[PDB]
Amino acid sequence: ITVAGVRQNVAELLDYSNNVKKRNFLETVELQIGLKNYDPQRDKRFSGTVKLPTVPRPNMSICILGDQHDIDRAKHGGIDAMSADDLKKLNKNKKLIKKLARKYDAFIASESLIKQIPRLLGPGLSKAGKFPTPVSHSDDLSAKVNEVKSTVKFQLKKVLCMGVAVGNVGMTQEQLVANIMLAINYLVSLLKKGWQNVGSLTIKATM
RNA sequence: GACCCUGUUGAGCUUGACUCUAGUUUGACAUUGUGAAAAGACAUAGGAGGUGUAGAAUAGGUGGGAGCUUCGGCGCCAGUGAAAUACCACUACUCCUAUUGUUUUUUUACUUAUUCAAUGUGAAGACAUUGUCAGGUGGGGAGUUCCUUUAGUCCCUCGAAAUUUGAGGCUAGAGGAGAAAAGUUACCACA
């Protein structure tokens, strides 16, 4: 891809689309990738994540699976703390867990609870795309969720097209372009061969 | 009456080497041309589409998305569902049309491929016949003396489904002089 080209593309909307619509949103821009002739029914399916230290996400909805030494820090940070009793009542009710997954699409988990969940309620709802990344031994949750989030999973499905929504109008062109370029470079690296495999890529905004 | 054994017979079970090959057989390709008429798949540019169950309802699929404005109807939230509908972005198949093009197959037509007859030219026909590779079987001919199970590292390949499997691969135990016949049975018949 060409830097000057993505420059007028971000210009085609960050200095035009918003003038055309002028609509009240927490505006986010998405770029979508479709590939020409690599059937997903075959082998070597790709699945990776991006380290994004910008997080144009910040309309956030996060859930935690924390053990002791986390209730107080979660309360101070304004995140609901979930423990063994709360988890066993989620174990009793099997639809409210899906409703709360909808409420908190994003999950984070600790070692003991990620080891304890696969008894019966793990695989039951595992068909939702909630893969919880285990926390490290640093146990310093300050901003660790910030790096854990905004990690887009380039997961290949039975449909041969996908999209990644990164970039808002609150932050500016240099870092939004840096984020999208690094996401594209990671996608090319994860793909089986050269960037020429990509047929068409759209950088147009939400409206 | 009944029990044991022997011989012949019947019924049943097992064994009867390996390597090439005759024969037989499957598939692909080649001689080998000219046309015409249809069919399939490739090339675009378009058009139309998605009804298992439950769901108000005909839910291609994926993505963001809490609020969308022809400014009144919608969302969201509730349901119901693997999947939820407002907003707007992408490619994925199915069914049709057109020309600014490629191939492959079927039928038909004609001889130049090819086949048959003769000597000091005629008939059939792109089918036969023939040839090259990949293989299957090989109780026949010639020569010489592969699969299955077990336990293991979770070490490698192929196939499948996505959040796991099947088949092979490795280590070393166990099964399978040779087309003349051989072994065997609390069985049958005769003696």
Coordinates of C-alpha atoms (C1' of nucleotides) in Angstrom, one line a residue:
Chain A
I1 CA 0.0 0.0 0.0
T2 CA 1.1 3.6 -0.5
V3 CA 1.4 6.1 2.3
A4 CA 0.3 9.1 0.1
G5 CA -2.7 7.1 -0.9
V6 CA -3.8 6.2 2.6
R7 CA -3.1 9.9 3.3
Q8 CA -5.8 11.1 0.8
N9 CA -8.0 8.3 2.0
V10 CA -7.9 9.5 5.6
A11 CA -8.3 13.0 4.1
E12 CA -11.3 11.8 2.0
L13 CA -13.3 11.4 5.2
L14 CA -11.6 13.0 8.2
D15 CA -11.8 16.3 6.2
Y16 CA -14.9 15.4 4.1
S17 CA -17.2 12.6 5.3
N18 CA -17.7 14.3 8.6
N19 CA -18.5 17.5 6.8
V20 CA -21.0 15.7 4.6
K21 CA -22.9 13.9 7.4
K22 CA -22.1 15.8 10.7
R23 CA -23.7 13.1 12.8
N24 CA -23.5 12.5 16.5
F25 CA -21.7 9.3 17.2
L26 CA -18.6 7.9 19.0
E27 CA -17.3 7.8 15.4
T28 CA -15.1 4.8 14.4
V29 CA -13.6 3.9 11.1
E30 CA -13.3 0.3 9.8
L31 CA -11.2 -1.3 7.1
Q32 CA -12.4 -4.5 5.5
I33 CA -10.3 -7.2 3.7
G34 CA -11.5 -9.7 1.1
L35 CA -9.2 -12.2 -0.5
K36 CA -9.3 -13.5 -4.0
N37 CA -8.8 -17.3 -4.2
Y38 CA -7.7 -18.8 -0.9
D39 CA -10.6 -21.1 0.1
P40 CA -11.1 -21.2 3.9
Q41 CA -12.2 -24.9 3.8
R42 CA -8.6 -26.0 3.3
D43 CA -5.8 -26.1 5.8
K44 CA -3.4 -23.4 7.2
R45 CA -6.2 -21.2 8.5
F46 CA -4.8 -18.1 10.2
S47 CA -5.6 -16.7 13.7
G48 CA -3.6 -14.0 15.3
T49 CA -3.7 -10.8 17.4
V50 CA -2.3 -7.3 17.2
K51 CA -0.6 -5.4 20.0
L52 CA -2.3 -2.0 19.7
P53 CA -1.1 0.6 22.2
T54 CA -3.5 3.3 21.0
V55 CA -7.0 1.7 21.7
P56 CA -9.5 3.7 19.6
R57 CA -12.0 1.4 21.4
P58 CA -12.6 3.4 24.5
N59 CA -16.4 2.9 24.5
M60 CA -15.5 0.1 26.8
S61 CA -17.3 -2.9 28.3
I62 CA -15.0 -5.2 30.3
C63 CA -15.5 -8.1 32.6
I64 CA -13.0 -9.7 34.9
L65 CA -12.5 -13.2 36.3
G66 CA -10.3 -12.4 39.3
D67 CA -9.3 -14.3 42.5
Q68 CA -8.4 -12.7 45.8
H69 CA -6.2 -9.6 46.0
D70 CA -8.3 -8.2 43.2
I71 CA -11.6 -7.2 44.7
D72 CA -10.3 -4.0 46.2
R73 CA -8.3 -2.9 43.1
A74 CA -11.3 -3.7 40.9
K75 CA -13.6 -1.6 43.2
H76 CA -11.1 1.3 43.1
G77 CA -10.9 1.0 39.3
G78 CA -14.7 0.8 39.0
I79 CA -14.9 -2.8 37.6
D80 CA -17.2 -5.4 39.1
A81 CA -15.4 -8.1 41.0
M82 CA -16.5 -11.7 40.3
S83 CA -15.7 -14.5 42.8
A84 CA -16.5 -18.2 43.5
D85 CA -20.1 -17.5 44.7
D86 CA -21.0 -15.3 41.8
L87 CA -19.4 -17.8 39.4
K88 CA -21.4 -20.7 40.9
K89 CA -24.7 -18.8 40.5
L90 CA -23.6 -18.2 36.8
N91 CA -23.0 -22.0 36.9
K92 CA -26.7 -22.5 37.9
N93 CA -28.2 -20.1 35.4
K94 CA -27.3 -20.9 31.8
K95 CA -29.0 -18.0 29.8
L96 CA -28.1 -15.1 32.1
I97 CA -24.4 -16.0 31.4
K98 CA -25.0 -15.4 27.7
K99 CA -26.9 -12.1 28.5
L100 CA -24.0 -10.9 30.6
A101 CA -21.5 -11.9 27.9
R102 CA -23.5 -9.7 25.6
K103 CA -23.3 -6.9 28.2
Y104 CA -19.6 -7.4 28.6
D105 CA -18.3 -8.7 25.2
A106 CA -14.7 -8.4 26.5
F107 CA -13.5 -10.8 29.1
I108 CA -10.2 -11.1 31.1
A109 CA -9.3 -14.1 33.2
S110 CA -6.8 -15.2 35.8
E111 CA -5.0 -18.6 36.0
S112 CA -7.0 -20.3 38.7
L113 CA -10.4 -19.3 37.2
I114 CA -9.4 -20.1 33.6
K115 CA -8.4 -23.5 35.0
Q116 CA -11.7 -23.8 37.0
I117 CA -14.2 -22.7 34.3
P118 CA -14.0 -25.7 31.8
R119 CA -15.9 -28.0 34.2
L120 CA -19.3 -27.6 32.5
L121 CA -20.0 -23.9 31.7
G122 CA -17.0 -23.3 29.6
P123 CA -17.7 -25.5 26.5
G124 CA -21.4 -24.8 26.9
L125 CA -21.1 -21.1 25.9
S126 CA -17.7 -21.4 24.2
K127 CA -19.6 -20.9 20.9
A128 CA -19.5 -17.1 21.4
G129 CA -16.0 -15.8 20.7
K130 CA -15.0 -14.9 24.3
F131 CA -11.5 -16.4 24.4
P132 CA -10.1 -15.1 27.7
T133 CA -6.4 -14.2 27.8
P134 CA -4.8 -15.3 31.1
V135 CA -3.2 -12.6 33.2
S136 CA 0.5 -12.6 34.0
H137 CA 2.3 -13.0 37.4
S138 CA 2.8 -9.2 37.6
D139 CA -0.7 -8.9 39.1
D140 CA -0.6 -5.2 38.3
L141 CA -4.0 -4.7 36.6
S142 CA -3.4 -1.0 36.0
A143 CA -3.5 -0.6 32.2
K144 CA -2.9 -4.3 31.7
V145 CA -6.5 -4.5 30.5
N146 CA -5.6 -1.5 28.3
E147 CA -3.0 -3.5 26.4
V148 CA -5.1 -6.6 26.5
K149 CA -8.0 -4.8 24.8
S150 CA -7.9 -3.5 21.2
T151 CA -6.2 -6.8 20.2
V152 CA -8.2 -7.7 17.1
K153 CA -8.4 -11.4 16.4
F154 CA -7.8 -12.1 12.7
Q155 CA -9.9 -15.3 12.7
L156 CA -10.7 -17.0 9.5
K157 CA -14.3 -18.2 9.2
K158 CA -16.2 -20.0 6.5
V159 CA -16.8 -16.7 4.7
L160 CA -13.9 -15.3 2.8
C161 CA -14.2 -11.6 3.9
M162 CA -13.7 -9.8 7.2
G163 CA -13.3 -6.4 8.7
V164 CA -11.4 -4.6 11.5
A165 CA -12.8 -1.4 13.1
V166 CA -9.9 0.8 14.3
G167 CA -9.6 4.5 14.5
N168 CA -11.8 7.3 15.7
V169 CA -12.2 11.0 15.1
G170 CA -11.1 11.9 18.7
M171 CA -7.5 11.0 18.0
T172 CA -5.6 12.3 15.0
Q173 CA -4.2 11.2 11.7
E174 CA -0.6 10.3 12.5
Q175 CA -1.5 7.6 15.1
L176 CA -4.7 6.4 13.5
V177 CA -2.7 5.8 10.3
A178 CA 0.1 4.2 12.3
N179 CA -2.4 1.8 13.9
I180 CA -4.0 0.8 10.6
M181 CA -0.6 0.4 8.8
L182 CA 0.7 -1.8 11.6
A183 CA -2.5 -3.9 11.6
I184 CA -2.2 -4.3 7.8
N185 CA 1.5 -5.3 8.1
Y186 CA 0.6 -7.9 10.7
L187 CA -2.2 -9.2 8.5
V188 CA 0.2 -9.5 5.6
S189 CA 2.8 -11.3 7.8
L190 CA 0.2 -13.7 9.1
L191 CA -1.1 -14.4 5.6
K192 CA 0.3 -17.3 3.7
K193 CA 2.1 -15.2 1.1
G194 CA 2.6 -11.7 -0.3
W195 CA 0.3 -8.7 0.1
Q196 CA -0.7 -9.1 -3.6
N197 CA -3.0 -11.9 -2.5
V198 CA -5.3 -9.2 -1.2
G199 CA -7.8 -8.3 -3.9
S200 CA -9.4 -5.2 -2.6
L201 CA -9.3 -3.2 0.7
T202 CA -11.7 -0.5 1.7
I203 CA -10.7 2.2 4.2
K204 CA -14.1 4.0 4.1
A205 CA -15.7 5.2 7.4
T206 CA -18.8 4.1 9.2
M207 CA -21.2 6.6 7.5
Chain B
rG1 C1' -27.3 -99.7 24.6
rA2 C1' -23.1 -97.2 25.4
rC3 C1' -16.9 -95.9 25.7
rC4 C1' -11.7 -95.8 23.3
rC5 C1' -8.9 -96.5 18.8
rU6 C1' -7.4 -97.6 13.4
rG7 C1' -8.2 -97.4 7.9
rU8 C1' -11.1 -95.3 3.8
rU9 C1' -14.8 -91.4 2.8
rG10 C1' -17.6 -87.0 3.5
rA11 C1' -18.1 -82.1 5.8
rG12 C1' -15.3 -78.2 7.9
rC13 C1' -10.5 -75.4 9.2
rU14 C1' -5.2 -74.2 8.1
rU15 C1' -0.8 -74.1 5.0
rG16 C1' 1.0 -74.4 0.2
rA17 C1' 8.0 -68.9 -0.5
rC18 C1' 9.9 -64.6 -3.1
rU19 C1' 11.2 -61.6 -7.9
rC20 C1' 10.0 -60.5 -13.1
rU21 C1' 6.5 -62.0 -16.9
rA22 C1' 2.6 -64.4 -20.6
rG23 C1' -2.5 -63.9 -20.4
rU24 C1' -6.5 -60.8 -18.5
rU25 C1' -8.1 -56.0 -16.9
rU26 C1' -9.0 -50.3 -15.3
rG27 C1' -7.5 -45.3 -16.4
rA28 C1' -4.9 -41.2 -18.9
rC29 C1' -2.4 -39.6 -23.3
rA30 C1' -0.8 -39.7 -28.8
rU31 C1' -1.6 -40.3 -34.7
rU32 C1' -5.4 -36.5 -36.2
rG33 C1' -7.9 -33.1 -40.3
rU34 C1' -11.7 -29.7 -42.2
rG35 C1' -16.7 -27.9 -41.2
rA36 C1' -21.6 -27.5 -39.3
rA37 C1' -25.3 -28.2 -35.1
rA38 C1' -25.9 -28.5 -29.5
rA39 C1' -23.8 -29.1 -24.2
rG40 C1' -20.3 -27.9 -19.8
rA41 C1' -16.7 -25.0 -17.6
rC42 C1' -13.5 -20.6 -18.1
rA43 C1' -14.1 -13.6 -19.4
rU44 C1' -16.5 -9.5 -18.1
rA45 C1' -20.7 -6.1 -17.5
rG46 C1' -25.2 -6.3 -15.6
rG47 C1' -30.2 -8.2 -13.4
rA48 C1' -32.8 -11.4 -9.6
rG49 C1' -32.3 -14.1 -5.2
rG50 C1' -31.8 -16.9 -0.3
rU51 C1' -38.6 -19.7 3.4
rG52 C1' -35.3 -26.7 8.5
rU53 C1' -37.1 -25.5 14.2
rA54 C1' -38.4 -21.4 17.3
rG55 C1' -39.0 -16.8 16.2
rA56 C1' -44.2 -11.0 14.6
rA57 C1' -41.4 -12.2 10.0
rU58 C1' -38.1 -15.2 3.6
rA59 C1' -32.0 -14.6 9.3
rG60 C1' -27.0 -15.2 2.4
rG61 C1' -22.6 -14.4 5.8
rU62 C1' -18.8 -10.9 8.3
rG63 C1' -17.8 -6.1 10.3
rG64 C1' -18.1 -2.2 13.3
rG65 C1' -22.6 0.3 15.4
rA66 C1' -26.1 3.3 20.4
rG67 C1' -28.7 5.8 19.0
rC68 C1' -31.2 6.6 13.1
rU69 C1' -33.4 11.4 10.6
rU70 C1' -37.3 13.2 3.3
rC71 C1' -37.2 14.2 11.1
rG72 C1' -41.9 9.5 12.0
rG73 C1' -41.4 5.9 12.2
rC74 C1' -37.7 3.2 14.0
rG75 C1' -33.6 1.5 17.3
rC76 C1' -31.7 -0.2 21.8
rC77 C1' -33.7 -2.9 25.6
rA78 C1' -37.4 -7.5 26.0
rG79 C1' -38.0 -12.0 23.8
rU80 C1' -37.1 -16.5 20.4
rG81 C1' -32.9 -18.2 18.6
rA82 C1' -25.7 -21.1 16.9
rA83 C1' -26.7 -16.5 14.9
rA84 C1' -31.1 -10.2 15.9
rU85 C1' -33.0 -6.9 13.1
rA86 C1' -32.0 0.9 13.3
rC87 C1' -27.1 3.0 10.3
rC88 C1' -23.8 1.9 6.6
rA89 C1' -19.2 -1.2 4.4
rC90 C1' -17.1 -5.9 2.2
rU91 C1' -17.3 -10.6 -0.7
rA92 C1' -20.0 -15.7 -1.1
rC93 C1' -22.7 -18.8 -3.5
rU94 C1' -27.4 -20.0 -6.7
rC95 C1' -30.4 -18.7 -11.2
rC96 C1' -30.8 -15.7 -15.8
rU97 C1' -29.2 -11.8 -20.1
rA98 C1' -25.7 -9.6 -23.6
rU99 C1' -20.8 -9.7 -26.6
rU100 C1' -15.9 -6.6 -27.0
rG101 C1' -13.3 -13.5 -26.2
rU102 C1' -11.2 -18.9 -24.5
rU103 C1' -11.3 -24.0 -23.9
rU104 C1' -13.4 -29.3 -23.3
rU105 C1' -17.4 -32.9 -24.7
rU106 C1' -21.6 -35.1 -27.9
rU107 C1' -24.0 -35.7 -32.9
rU108 C1' -23.7 -35.1 -38.0
rA109 C1' -21.0 -34.1 -42.8
rC110 C1' -16.3 -34.6 -46.1
rU111 C1' -11.4 -36.9 -47.0
rU112 C1' -5.8 -35.7 -46.1
rA113 C1' -4.6 -39.6 -40.5
rU114 C1' -5.4 -44.8 -40.6
rU115 C1' -7.2 -50.0 -42.4
rC116 C1' -8.1 -53.7 -46.9
rA117 C1' -7.4 -55.7 -52.3
rA118 C1' -3.9 -55.7 -56.9
rU119 C1' -0.1 -54.4 -60.4
rG120 C1' 4.3 -55.0 -65.6
rU121 C1' -5.4 -48.0 -59.3
rG122 C1' -10.5 -48.7 -55.9
rA123 C1' -13.4 -49.4 -50.7
rA124 C1' -14.1 -48.1 -45.6
rG125 C1' -13.2 -44.1 -42.5
rA126 C1' -11.2 -39.4 -38.0
rC127 C1' -14.3 -44.9 -35.6
rA128 C1' -11.3 -49.1 -35.4
rU129 C1' -6.5 -51.0 -35.3
rU130 C1' -1.8 -49.5 -32.9
rG131 C1' 1.7 -47.3 -29.4
rU132 C1' 3.6 -44.9 -24.4
rC133 C1' 2.9 -44.4 -19.1
rA134 C1' 0.2 -45.3 -14.3
rG135 C1' -1.9 -49.3 -12.0
rG136 C1' -5.2 -54.6 -10.4
rU137 C1' -4.9 -60.0 -10.7
rG138 C1' -1.6 -63.5 -11.9
rG139 C1' -2.9 -72.0 -8.8
rG140 C1' 0.2 -70.4 -15.7
rG141 C1' 5.9 -69.4 -17.8
rA142 C1' 11.5 -68.0 -16.3
rG143 C1' 15.1 -67.2 -12.1
rU144 C1' 17.0 -67.3 -6.6
rU145 C1' 17.2 -68.7 -1.3
rC146 C1' 2.3 -56.4 2.5
rC147 C1' -0.9 -55.5 5.8
rU148 C1' -2.8 -56.4 11.7
rU149 C1' -2.0 -56.1 17.2
rU150 C1' 0.9 -54.8 21.5
rA151 C1' 3.8 -50.4 24.8
rG152 C1' 6.4 -45.9 24.2
rU153 C1' 8.2 -40.2 22.8
rC154 C1' 3.0 -37.0 22.5
rC155 C1' 8.5 -37.5 17.1
rC156 C1' 6.6 -36.7 11.1
rU157 C1' 2.9 -37.0 6.7
rC158 C1' -2.1 -37.4 4.6
rG159 C1' -7.7 -36.9 5.6
rA160 C1' -11.6 -34.6 8.5
rA161 C1' -13.8 -30.9 12.2
rA162 C1' -12.6 -26.5 14.0
rU163 C1' -11.2 -25.4 19.6
rU164 C1' -10.4 -32.2 18.2
rU165 C1' -10.1 -37.2 15.5
rG166 C1' -8.9 -41.4 11.9
rA167 C1' -5.1 -43.8 8.7
rG168 C1' -0.2 -44.3 7.9
rG169 C1' 5.6 -43.2 9.6
rC170 C1' 9.8 -44.9 14.1
rU171 C1' 11.7 -48.3 18.2
rA172 C1' 11.0 -54.4 19.0
rG173 C1' 7.6 -58.9 20.3
rA174 C1' 3.5 -61.4 18.2
rG175 C1' 0.3 -63.8 12.6
rG176 C1' -0.1 -65.0 7.8
rA177 C1' 11.8 -76.3 -0.7
rG178 C1' 6.4 -74.1 -1.7
rA179 C1' 0.8 -76.1 -6.7
rA180 C1' 3.4 -82.0 -5.7
rA181 C1' 0.6 -82.0 -1.8
rA182 C1' 0.7 -81.6 3.7
rG183 C1' -1.4 -80.9 8.7
rU184 C1' -6.1 -81.1 11.7
rU185 C1' -11.2 -82.5 14.1
rA186 C1' -14.3 -85.7 21.5
rC187 C1' -18.1 -84.5 13.9
rC188 C1' -20.6 -88.1 9.7
rA189 C1' -20.8 -92.9 6.7
rC190 C1' -18.7 -97.7 5.8
rA191 C1' -15.3 -101.5 7.5

